[PDB]
């Protein structure tokens, strides 16, 4: 004891980078205050049995730890410190040790197999170190072990099959390591096991079919491994299971119908695997299921209509599969379903009438299916909608009567469908909407002026419709729009000068329209604009000087127009320009003396113009093909179609 206090003082004297504030300053007067005043020290019969120095800013190693001088230690917590070096084998000499914690340190090297001498150990904690090598098989001798936590280390090798001998183990935490080989089937003998977390390892092989004997496991986490084979049906015998995560593995075969026998399963994560076959009908009998994610697999066939029995279903992720047939009404019948992911599948038919029947659905994705028909009325009135994605389908109907008011809408994608009718001003009620994408529809009429009052809009895409009318100057009110795509419509009149005010604009496409008259002279106030496509319009007259004040331009296409006059010299201010397309115009006059001053241009086209004179000295001009440069009145100093 006095010898115990001296031994710990000698060890303390080896600590480096210590201050006077250290709580170990109380290690004084070894002869008379060891069991009463020393921080972290506690004794029985005047002999230390408990050393709890967690989070005491100790920097040092265990090389000179007084193993022999503290024979009666039973609780060692040295965690949350700056200990380095290895775990000496002499730690196995503490025959009375019950609790052993060296976690959250900078320990390196392997776990000494001498820990298997610690026959009284009930808790082993070595997490968040850099321990490498294999887990010693002799740890399987510690049959009083209740919990092993070795996670967040650099451990390799297989899980020892002796671990099946730990008949009292309740928690096994080995995640965030590099454990390999097959999971030993002897783990199925751990009848007291409650939590088995082997995730984020490099485990291979099959999930052992003996896991069906783990009747007390509530948490099985094995995700982010390299497991192969099939999910054994015996997994359905783990009746206590609450969370089952096998995602990001290389599992194959079908989902076993026995999973429907897991009456306590709330979370099931099987995503990012190679599962095939149909979803068994019995999956609907998981009455507790809250969060079902089997997305990113190769599942085929229809979704079972029994899914209407999952009355606690909140999240359903079936995206990126080969699911087919019509969507059954039960898939969306839960009153608490808030997320329904079905995109990237082969669903056909029309949306069921149950979609938002409880007014609580928030995210709905249907992208890249073969769905058709009208929007169900419960979806029209789904005021809780936040994200809705319909891209790449054949949905039909009047876009004005198909979608109600969506006060919580944030993102909606109607692209690549057959929606008809006119854009209603109801969208302005979506005061939180940041993106509205409706490309490739049969949308007609004008853009309602209320759209320009959606200052929160970041991205507006109405391209490839049959929208008509002239754009008002109130377009300037879209303060925060960065991607504006109105191309491929029948919009007419002059381009509004108010686009000047869209300071956040980065990508602007007004091409393939009926915009007439001169490009606005004032359009010089877009410092973030790197793309502007005005091609295939009825614009005419000189290219304005205002365009040349958009320094951040990288692509600029004014082709297929009726612009005339000379190309300005002032383009030199567009030093960040790379692609410049000016073909199919009536541009005339000589080439500017500059365009040597630019070094970023890589692509150009000036064909089918009345330009004359010599080509300048830049790569795109040297690298131009015949199509790039033909059609002009007097091309080059030496009448050349190609180099020099």
């Amino acid at each position: 004891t006095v010898s115990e206090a001296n031994a710990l003082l000698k060890w303390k004297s080896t600590f480096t980078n210590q201050t006077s504030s250290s709580k170990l300053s109380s290690w004084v007067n070894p002869n008379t205050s060891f069991c009463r005043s020393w921080y972290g020290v506690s004794c029985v019969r005047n002999s230390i049995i408990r050393l709890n120095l967690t989070n005491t800013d100790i920097e040092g190693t265990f090389q000179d730890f007084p193993f022999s001088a503290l024979p009666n230690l039973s609780y060692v917590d040295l965690s949350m410190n700056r200990f380095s070096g290895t775990i000496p084998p002499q730690f196995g000499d503490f025959s009375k040790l019950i609790y052993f914690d060296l976690s959250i340190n900078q320990l390196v090297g392997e776990i000494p197999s001498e820990l298997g001498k610690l026959s009284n150990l009930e808790t082993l904690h070595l997490v968040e170190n850099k321990l490498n090598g294999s887990i010693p098989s002799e740890i399987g001798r510690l049959t009083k072990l209740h919990e092993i936590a070795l996670y967040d280390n650099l451990l390799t090798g297989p899980i020892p099959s002796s671990f099946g001998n730990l008949t009292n183990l309740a928690n096994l935490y080995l995640f965030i390591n590099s454990l390999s080989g097959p999971i030993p089937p002897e783990l199925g003998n751990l009848s007291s096991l409650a939590e088995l977390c082997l995730d984020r390892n490099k485990l291979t092989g099959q999930i052992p079919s003996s896991f069906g004997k783990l009747k007390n496991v509530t948490l099985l986490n094995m995700f982010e491994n390299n497991l192969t084979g099939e999910i054994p049906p015996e997994i359905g015998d783990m009746s206590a299971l609450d969370t089952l995560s096998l995602h990001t593995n290389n599992l194959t075969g079908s989902i076993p119908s026995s999973l429907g026998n897991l009456k306590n399963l709330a979370i099931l994560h099987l995503y990012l695997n190679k599962l095939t076959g149909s979803i068994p009908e019995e999956l609907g009998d998981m009455e507790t299921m809250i969060d079902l994610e089997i997305s990113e697999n190769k599942l085929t066939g229809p979704v079972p209509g029994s899914f209407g029995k999952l009355t606690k279903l909140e999240w359903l992720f079936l995206r990126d599969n080969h699911l087919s047939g019509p969507i059954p009404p039960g898939i969306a019948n839960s009153s608490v379903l808030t997320v329904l992911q079905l995109d990237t599948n082969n669903f056909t038919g029309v949306l069921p009438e149950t979609i938002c029947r409880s007014g609580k659905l928030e995210n709905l994705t249907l992208d890249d299916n073969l769905l058709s028909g009208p929007i169900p009325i419960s979806l029209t009135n789904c005021k809780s909608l936040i994200r809705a994605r319909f891209k790449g389908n054949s949905f039909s109907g009047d876009i004005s009567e198909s979608f109600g008011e969506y006060p919580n809408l944030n993102f909606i994608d109607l692209s690549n469908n057959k929606f008809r009718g006119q854009i209603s001003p109801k969208w302005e009620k979506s005061r939180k909407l940041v993106a509205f994408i409706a490309t490739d529809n049969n949308i007609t009429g004008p853009i309602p002026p209320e759209i320009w009052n959606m200052t929160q809009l970041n991205q507006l895409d109405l391209s490839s419709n049959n929208i008509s009318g002239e754009l008002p100057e109130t377009i300037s009110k879209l303060t925060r729009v960065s991607k504006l795509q109105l191309n491929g419509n029948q919009l007419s009149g002059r381009i509004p000068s108010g686009i000047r005010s869209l300071a956040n604009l980065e990508y602007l496409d007004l091409s393939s329209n009926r915009f007439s008259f001169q490009i606005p002279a004032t359009l010089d106030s877009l410092p973030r604009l790197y793309y502007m496509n005005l091609s295939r319009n009825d614009l005419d007259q000189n290219i304005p000087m205002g365009l040349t004040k958009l320094s951040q331009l990288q692509t600029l296409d004014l082709s297929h127009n009726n612009l005339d006059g000379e190309i300005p010299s002032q383009f030199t201010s567009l030093q960040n320009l790379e692609k410049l397309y000016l073909q199919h115009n009536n541009l005339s006059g000589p080439i500017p003396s500059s365009f040597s001053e630019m070094k970023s241009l890589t692509h150009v086209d000036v064909s089918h113009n009345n330009l004359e004179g010599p080509i300048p000295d830049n790569a795109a001009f040297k690298n131009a093909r015949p199509d790039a440069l033909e059609g002009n009145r007097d091309l080059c100093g030496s009448n050349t179609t190609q180099g020099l």
Partner: peptide, 5 residues
Amino acid sequence: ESSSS
């Protein structure tokens, strides 16, 4: 120390 994943 000793937390579920």
